[PDB]
Symmetry: C2
Subunit: 73 residues, 2 copies
């Protein structure tokens, strides 16, 4: 919850859709979830799987994650 | 073509922050990345590492990703 009875949430805006919206398509269908549920479920899962076990060797890879997430052709 | 306006990033909104913003706190600090940068770098990174190799045996784990995303109960 992190609020009282119902889980709190705020309208958050981002700038993407080309890849995220298209990718959200397979995940949404394959995960039977919404682009928000997927992105919001993937986001946390990332931090959770990264932070919770944030290795010293992966530290620099964090850059790879952000610099690779947005590939260029 | 209608690129940029059609084939490009679009301002996407999601109703969250309670958990995502709080979680984005460790990631943003540990990753020195803004929430949008992390949520957007995590999203792609998630699909990239998960979707790109979305296994049939992992299907059930997807529930874990959801039930785990909210570590309260």
């Amino acid at each position: 919850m992190v609020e009282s009875k119902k889980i709190a949430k705020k309208k958050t805006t981002l700038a993407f859709d080309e890849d995220v919206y298209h990718t959200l398509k397979l995940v949404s269908v394959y995960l039977n979830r919404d682009m928000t549920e997927i992105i919001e479920e993937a986001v946390v899962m990332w931090l959770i799987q990264n932070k919770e076990k944030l290795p010293n060797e992966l530290k620099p890879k964090i850059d790879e994650i952000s610099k690779r997430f947005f590939p260029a052709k």
